[PDB]
Amino acid sequence: GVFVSNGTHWFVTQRNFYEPQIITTDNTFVSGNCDVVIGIVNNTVYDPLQPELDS
Amino acid sequence: PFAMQMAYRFNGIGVTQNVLYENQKLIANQFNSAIGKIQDSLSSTASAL
Ligand SMILES: *[C@@H]1O[C@H](CO)[C@@H](O[C@@H]2O[C@H](CO)[C@@H](O)[C@H](O)[C@H]2NC(C)=O)[C@H](O)[C@H]1NC(C)=O
Ligand SMILES: *[C@@H]1O[C@H](CO)[C@@H](O[C@@H]2O[C@H](CO)[C@@H](O)[C@H](O)[C@H]2NC(C)=O)[C@H](O)[C@H]1NC(C)=O
Ligand SMILES: *[C@@H]1O[C@H](CO)[C@@H](O)[C@H](O)[C@H]1NC(C)=O
Question: Which residues does the annotation flag as glycosylated (chain A)?
Fold first, then answer.
């Protein structure tokens, strides 16, 4: 899918039907540094186990 | 946007889209050279059609 912005907040959605989700580390994958992509944007990637598990 | 269209076509043949975003200028140069070669081979060769 694609990263979209509703004006204020950034989400990820599938391309053929609008259904915005929170950008986590299960939605995305990492590759490389931030200086080789033309048009990269600063935002946060939420880690889905830090509120549920700090035992 | 056109580079996002090219990234998901790269995804359609089984390459990850970061390969395109990391080699974007090399890929655009290779495309522009290939169009120029088509134009030269049509501009001077007289049996193509
Ligand atoms: C863009 O999305 C954000 C995230 O949902 C919206 O912010 C929320 O707005 C609702 C209703 O006003 C609030 O109940 C939530 O508390 C807000 N969330 C946060 C994290 O602030 C935002 O309003 C959206 N913008 C537009 C123009 O639709
Ligand atoms: C996105 O965030 C990065 C990191 O916070 C910013 O990069 C910094 O940019 C300043 C000058 O603008 C440099 O002096 C810092 O050394 C940079 N930090 C790093 C870690 O390299 C970047 O400017 C931000 N971009 C936008 C558009 O806000
Ligand atoms: C989009 O165009 C603006 C100029 O209008 C430019 O500053 C920006 O870098 C461009 N973004 C991308 C991803 O090419």
Answer: 6, 42
Cβ contact A31–B24 (<8 Å): no
Flag whether residue A4 sits within 8 Å of chain B, measured between CB atoms: no
| Phi, psi dihedral angles at A25 (to 5 degrees) | -85, 5
Which ligand is nearest to the Cα of residue B2, counting in written order?
3
Burial B12-43 (b: 16+ CB within 10 A, else e): eeeeebbebbeebeebeeeeeeeeeeeeeeee
Q: Which atom of ligand 3 is nearest to the CA of A38?
A: 13
Number of Cβ within a 10 Å radius of residue B7: 19
Q: Go through A18-37 and write b for each residue having 16 or more CB atoms within 10 A of its CB, e for each that does not.
A: eeeeebeeeeeeeeeeeeee
Residues in the ligand 1 pocket, defined by CB under 6 Å: A 6-9
- How was it solved? cryo-EM
- Distance, in angstroms, between B23 CA and closest chain A CA? 9
